[model samples]
Target: GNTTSSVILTNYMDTQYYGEIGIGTPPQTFKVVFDTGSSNVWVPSSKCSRLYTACVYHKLFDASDSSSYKHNGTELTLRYSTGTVSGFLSQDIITVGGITVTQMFGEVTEMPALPFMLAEFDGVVGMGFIEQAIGRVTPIFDNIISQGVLKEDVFSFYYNRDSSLGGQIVLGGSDPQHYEGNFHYINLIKTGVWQIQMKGVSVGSSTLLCEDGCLALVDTGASYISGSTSSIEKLMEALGAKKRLFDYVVKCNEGPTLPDISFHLGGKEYTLTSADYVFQESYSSKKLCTLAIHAMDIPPPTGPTWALGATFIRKFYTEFDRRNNRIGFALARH
Candidate 1:
């Protein structure tokens, strides 16, 4: 009943091509993250005064050469998990996959502090539904629709990670492959994160934890999957893995080789391997650390929330059918 009435996909095709943008003479080329949650395309500026070391991705748009580059002088504010940046808006011809889109939205950052950005990603392209395109007069999708590039009202996304295991998202149409399958469909909560309630957590044949349950947010952008301390502890204990430690470290060494972990949802079971629950060192040479299963002792008002990141999604292809108010998943094939 969490489903909404909207097409899953639309027949609109935007050209995909690539090009370089940098400072001085010829602009350097960089990769881009195409995202739907945001509305602006921003890139680092050549005028950045910070030392080159602080900025990992140094590519900048040479606003001087391109005839299309037009400075609007309007400052823009954008936010992210790491930090925020303010900049001016500009127009430029962006080329990707050999195709060029004229007068694309580009934000030139005069200054930024976050260091996680790579030198190769000059900027990100915003593909979400928020602002209209073409001088704020026409919707961006309108141009694609008018161009006759799409085939239907609904567009579909089939993200295949493995040959036998990926999933699909139907934009305008339902994925015939997953429709009415053996999987159980749960209703999504209306706010905060796109989340679902987990009925229980189990390991092999043992039911380690259960509740009216816990909320699980499915995010592709996350690098790792996280869960509540008590639930994780109960599950790990059920697996019989021994714990070892270092600073901020929790891991298992002597337990029986753990079997696949599964979550019971709606009536179907989705499983993951023991390796999925394990954590490898991201900073130290020591490759010893079990996934953190202890809750940081904090006031009741400030507690941690459970999360599921890429490690979990990588096991299947996920589709966020926002228009339909439903999410679809399928086993992917690498």
Candidate 2:
């Protein structure tokens, strides 16, 4: 039966945001970040002593509510770009986009330190291949498919940029809006950070570097984008964009200009723009930021090549077709 091969997962969002989660009897909502890098849904605990203002919607799973809600009394540690958080595990009914799944796994925190968690979000949701492949016994897509929640067995995604060409991710099926261009399919590296062996990177019409043997990770979970130090500097220099050494802030002499950027996968070319590479500061609306390519030194042997993130992805419609084990990208009509 389809039930044997499928598992359902819900999409959560804070009260105000699209991906938020709420907890407790009253159910306060908090914005939630869906991550593919990790496999756990965590939020600031109601027991946290500091910064209570941001956790208004955070819910601590009550063990008493569900017989399956176990109080392991165990602590779990999670690492982020800014800091690490420690919490415990509990089971509860998790809801997303009005879809609810009972006895879902979640985290209960004891301390608060991450600034990003201080936002309107409820917490983080993990949507990774491993959690689906191993822990759950059934992947999230399979669950959605079995439940008849979508129009097709295929799931597609499109992430539009507020500043530049947008990107999308297609799951199960391809997005018809942006399937016209030549599709460059690359082998996804199964080891060490969900990486890929990119052929190289280019700016506008010129090929800047060949990363044939270099490893790059295609991360949708990362909020802040990053890449190899050397490749990034060289590409930045070629773009004629002013570079700030420490912060990796690039300034454009003109308004909202995007230089042509492309990535070589196998033998095909997928192009993007400066706007797709840059990001806006969380606190400041006036300042724009790019992947701090030089934020850290690329270690030898497995030195970084490109760590692609939302900024680059927002330009096209993308699809993470786990069923076929391929991540597809296409241009968007709108």
Candidate 3:
């Protein structure tokens, strides 16, 4: 029999999806992002004595309060696009939804104020492979599998595009109710992250980009569908979007006039309409719109990789099958 755990995640302005997690003996709860882009679970700790803004705003973990806490003594520094988190290793029992297991996670003493201070969640719980984890620590999912918590080693995500509605993340297996029809499976091209092959991208019937082939990473941690700077710039121009700061902004009311953008992957064409690619929010009785595609050129060795983030997942139900080393996609229900 296969047993699964379901965690209802809160969506914050369509920018982030996160859920509650319990740590330690008595179980102190913390909200964390289930990030698939990288691995290594981390949370602010009570040891943060400097009163950093990131630590002050978040619920810190007091390791001394837990009877199950074990110090590993290895310090770690985690870097991200916005900033870095400095911490040390610690072991404790963690609870996610219905599943519980002993795991090693970071107890961050220093976290930058730029992102985390203004972020909605207290910490991040990485869902990527162990190889991508800092220090190659065994990820929480692996611990779930090795501990025999689930017969099926798989996890699925259903992100509701509507910011008012919450999403769901399933551990052990996927919930068919959240999706339509059968799921199309594709094998991973790499082991460290959820990497796949993207054949091409099309703006309309004739315009094509990345004609040969490129690598794409399915990242739940990212809010936008990121591509090479040149490609994204072209796409923005094709969409007639004007630049706002470093991002592209669109006319909120003219969304219907934009063309459909399609991503060709796994021999299947997944297309998104203008409504799907544009993110709109009300600001003082005015509706402001922003494009979900971002320009980010990866550095050498792993150059020109695309990141299919929340914008893509909102259109498709995504399943990561760790046991089979494959990913599955199906049309998601609103």
Candidate 4:
């Protein structure tokens, strides 16, 4: 017996993948990023100040529009690398993949202009644990499980590299059609985030990072694979790439000669070649290709970590098993 629902995701420039969910009694639809890096559901509020500009273009949620909306004034804030997003708590009925559940969410009153103003999605629906949520709100998926909306406490993501085809997020179970071969499951190292141990990383035949095992987070919020500054420098050197702003660039023609990168996890090796790691863009006939990776260091309680982002997810179908707190990976079906 199987019970599952799928929400089609819209791929934006291969940098972002998002899906739509409804909120309130009448259900106001909004596109949101189902981010696993943090836990907190938030959408732009109609009460957002005109000065924010970040909330101007996107769809705004108004409490008065729905009869099921419950007002809560608890203030919440989340800090990002770009800036802070501040909001207040609110309660309403949320619908995901056709399943409705009463949930608490944030009504963002203000947000940073840099990333928010440029983002394609209207809001974020965090898929991480409640530990990271502001106001300690239960995660949407957790609420769904608690409400018995799903028979199994599992969810999976399938990201199509081609923007035209988009992708899907399967709730309650995984879809076999999206992947090929058997899945290799890895136990989570921690509970706060979907973190696991990375046995090692290699470039071609040379092992470059995590030679003695290191922590790796399967973060959907991050668009590219991230590692410590020191670690990325070594990787950049191996690919003969040079820094360009926050990204690394290499001669487009040299991509064919570049080495393949691989990650060892759960007694299995996942790999990406230059074609997969390097993104090609062009202005008329002029081509510019950049390495789909960046330098990010989360020290201390987090540490010099590796965050596998969309780049890795596109190659592997990822499943988040809340019941067992493990991650499953299978080769994606293009």
Largest lDDT belongs to which candidate? Answer: 4
TM-score of each: 0.58, 0.70, 0.94, 0.96
TM-score of 3: 0.94
lDDT of 3: 0.85
Candidate 4: deviation at residue 306, Å?
0.9
* Best of the candidates, TM-score: 4
lDDT of 3 by residue, 288-329 (tens): 588888887766444568989889999999999998888999
**Per-residue accuracy of model 4 over 110-165 as CA lDDT, tens digit each:** 87788888888888888999887777889899988887767689989998886455
Model 2 steric clash total: 35
Please report, in order, the local distance difference test score of every candidate based on alpha carbons.
Answer: 0.46, 0.51, 0.85, 0.86
State the lDDT at 326 in candidate 3: 88
For residue 193, model 4's alpha carbon misses the true position, in angstroms, by: 1.6
Error in Å for residue 306 of model 3 = 0.7
Q: Say which prediction, candidate 1 or candidate 2, comes out ahead on TM-score.
A: 2
Candidate 3 C-alpha error for residue 213, in Å: 0.7
Q: Which pairs of residues collide in candidate 4?
A: none
Comparing 1 and 3 on TM-score, the stronger one: 3
Q: Rank by TM-score, highest first.
A: 4, 3, 2, 1
Per-residue lDDT over 1-334 for candidate 2, one digit per residue giving the tens place of the 0 to 100 score: 1122111222222011124455443454545555555556666665555554344445444445444444545566765544456766555555554444542344545445356444444566655554332234333334455566554444444544442233333333565655557444555666323457777677778777764456665655554346666666676677655567555554432324646777776666777765456543332435545542443443543345456555545555555555445556666555
RMSD, candidate 3, Å: 2.1
Q: What is the Cα-based lDDT of residue 280 in candidate 2?
A: 33
